[PDB]
């Protein structure tokens, strides 16, 4: 009946696995054994941003590395001026259960969504001057886990219904749908060249998609539990993963396999956010133990800890310029580090 | 020189209005209480929703003694709830509604309660436990055509606690059955409570009009206990 299909499907997995093993020429540690350590990074909390009433679930930076958007589960999406610590806008949300936020590269729009299953796009440069909704993207049958802009008219989204979608804001409807995840997709990171983007789901895997074609290029596995964070290596040829198994791993698109694992025996809590530095040498990972650690991305050496939060760290972000790192936590405060 | 300071003072003026609005919104926000109404599809959640409303999130707002309650029912999700349940860490309590007549689903309900109670992020939130459809349970028990021992062998070795206060006219069989159902959940809760949170069991029907009063009463004690723990009185 289906014996041939089953046999071929089972054998193809080993076909891929053997090629991966053969390509496994040498572990990254053996190539990075002699290279100097970063040292110890004594990053200090420079600013603390207060005004959110409840847990902060998402935070994102603008292209200019000054303006900062953050979404709290009290129904507010504040835009902070990081240099001055002042606020610019306070967008009241129709639903209190926001779970993600994004800053359009142009800065004219800001996005948010959550258990409402609707991705709402806001306009911060209206003719009247007051922040107001611009579109309410609907079509996902699950909570919106992450959303990022490719440009002012396209936003890529991830939903708890195990699908990722690409929207056209003016049209207000999907254009290409990404299917293949087995569990809830929890995060996505658009490529620096915005041609590809990778998303991690609650199935112990991350997948590489093509924004234009919509096909699945590569599925990455190796984690043991749900993946909660994803971040592209700045070069665009690798990406880091955060998961509930208390480890972070670095995957390479061309090699098609894990290149390094970042773990410690005293860490038994999950990773909630992952973000590289500008040069890619420093990997910053937030944890449920209220601590954000700094991993040397080439030697898997913990070079520092950003201990300043009560309650879990929710979101992590590095300025495009690289002059600061933003940390949001369920303590309802945002802290800027450098 | 003039332009820079003009812009900076304008930004400060805008931030002042933002702060004022946030202050008023904090007043409103902390004035209300937030509840996560949770339970199986066959549980009579709709009956409770109607009972409040007489006064894909089906938010429900009701008011008792000038205290504003806000009740949420997340119905637009899949069955894998382990990720969106974390959004409700701040809720005052979880309203767990249970069908006490469906013995097949009782173990599923107990497992869900066990997971909610011990979850790393929800193990600070008290649970108001509503054992719904008690008239159906009574009819099924006096009917005799179904036995609870087949699904819970421990029933043959259970006797009602002295504190049980059966309503007038109840057969001993029905009170024993319902108090066993209650005691399963109480066992789960007392196994690892650690005094951080408590479960408040109640019985109710589809034609009961006092569920909002019960939620108000239970929330009062939940907040009272949290405050006393905050001030080190315990």
């Amino acid at each position, epitope marked *: 009946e289906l014996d041939q299909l089953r046999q071929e499907a089972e054998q193809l*997995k080993n076909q891929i696995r053997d090629a991966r093993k053969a390509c496994a020429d040498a572990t990254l540690s053996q190539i990075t054994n002699n290279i100097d350590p970063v040292g110890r990074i004594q990053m200090r909390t420079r600013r603390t941003l207060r005004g959110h009433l409840a847990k902060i679930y998402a935070m994102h930076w603008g292209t200019d590395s000054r303006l900062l958007v953050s979404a709290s589960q009290d129904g507010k999406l504040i835009i902070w001026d990081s240099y001055t610590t002042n606020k610019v806008h306070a967008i009241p949300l129709r639903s209190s259960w926001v779970m993600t936020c994004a800053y359009a590269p142009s800065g004219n729009y800001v996005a948010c969504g959550g258990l409402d299953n609707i991705c709402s796009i806001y306009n911060l440069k209206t003719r009247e001057g007051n922040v107001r909704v611009s579109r309410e993207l609907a079509g996902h049958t699950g909570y919106l886990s992450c959303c990022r802009f490719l440009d002012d008219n396209q936003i890529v989204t991830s939903s708890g219904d195990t699908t990722c979608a690409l929207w056209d804001i003016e049209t207000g409807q999907q254009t290409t749908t990404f299917t293949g995840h*087995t*569990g809830d997709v929890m995060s996505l990171s658009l490529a620096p060249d915005t041609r590809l983007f990778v998303s991690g789901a*609650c*199935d*112990a895997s991350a997948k590489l998609w093509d924004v234009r074609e919509g096909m699945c290029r590569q599925t990455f*596995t190796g984690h*043991e*539990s*749900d993946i909660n964070a994803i971040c592209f290596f700045p070069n665009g040829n690798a990406f880091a993963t955060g998961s*509930d*198994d*208390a480890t972070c791993r670095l995957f390479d698109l061309r090699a098609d396999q894990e290149l390094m694992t970042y773990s410690h025996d005293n860490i*038994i809590c*999950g990773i909630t956010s992952v973000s590289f530095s500008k040069s890619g040498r420093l990997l910053l990972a937030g944890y449920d133990d209220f601590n954000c650690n700094v991993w040397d991305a080439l030697k898997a050496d913990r070079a520092g800890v950003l201990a300043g939060h009560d309650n879990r760290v929710s979101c992590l972000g590095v300025t495009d310029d690289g002059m600061a790192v933003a940390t949001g936590s369920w303590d309802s405060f945002l802290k800027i580090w450098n | 020189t003039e332009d820079q300071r003009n812009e900076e003072k304008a930004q400060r003026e805008a931030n002042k209005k933002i702060e004022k609005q946030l202050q008023k919104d904090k007043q409103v926000y902390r004035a209300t209480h937030r509840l996560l109404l949770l339970g199986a599809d066959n549980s009579g959640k709709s009956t409770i929703v109607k009972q409040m409303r007489i006064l894909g999130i089906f938010e429900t707002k009701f008011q008792v003694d000038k205290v504003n309650f806000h009740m949420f029912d997340v119905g637009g999700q*899949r*069955d*894998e*709830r*382990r990720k969106w349940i974390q959004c409700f860490n701040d809720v005052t309590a979880i309203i767990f509604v249970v069908d006490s007549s469906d013995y097949n689903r009782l*173990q*599923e309900a107990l*497992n869900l309660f*066990k*997971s*909610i109670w*011990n*979850n*790393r992020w929800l193990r600070t939130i008290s649970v108001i436990l509503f054992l719904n459809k008690q008239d159906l349970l009574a009819e099924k028990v006096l009917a005799g055509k179904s036995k609870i021992e*087949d*699904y*819970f*062998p*421990e029933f043959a070795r259970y006797t009602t606690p002295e504190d049980a206060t059966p309503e007038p006219g109840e057969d001993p069989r029905v009170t024993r059955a319902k108090y066993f159902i209650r005691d399963e959940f109480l066992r789960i809760s007392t196994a*690892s409570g650690d005094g951080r949170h408590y479960c408040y069991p109640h019985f109710t029907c589809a034609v009961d009009t006092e569920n909002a009063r019960r939620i108000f009463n239970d929330c009062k004690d939940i907040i009272l206990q949290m405050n006393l723990r905050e001030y080190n009185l315990v």
Partner: nanobody
Amino acid sequence: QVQLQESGGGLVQPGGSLRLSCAASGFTFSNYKMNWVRQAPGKGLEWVSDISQSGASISYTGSVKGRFTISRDNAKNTLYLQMNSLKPEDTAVYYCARCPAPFTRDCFDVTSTTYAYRGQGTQVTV
């Protein structure tokens, strides 16, 4: 990959006994609470029993207590379910399931739809 594969099952005369074996590979078996879940024909998923990390904590659904007994061997990353005196109502597809995250007492894994950390399943016929 996080691979769970079940073994055992098959036709059994009413009564008798069987032994289900789930081989866990790709993840640290010692670190996870593990469960058995059943889906009878024409019925939804049901949770059978669970065993904690060490084996010092155990629980069963009442309908099988005294008939089944779970066991695990951490050193060989294998989980066992020994079934005795199978009633005809016990015929169902049995899956070995792993709780989603390590070092926790909570699990959300009896899903009508797909769930990631669970084997293909074995059918037991009485």
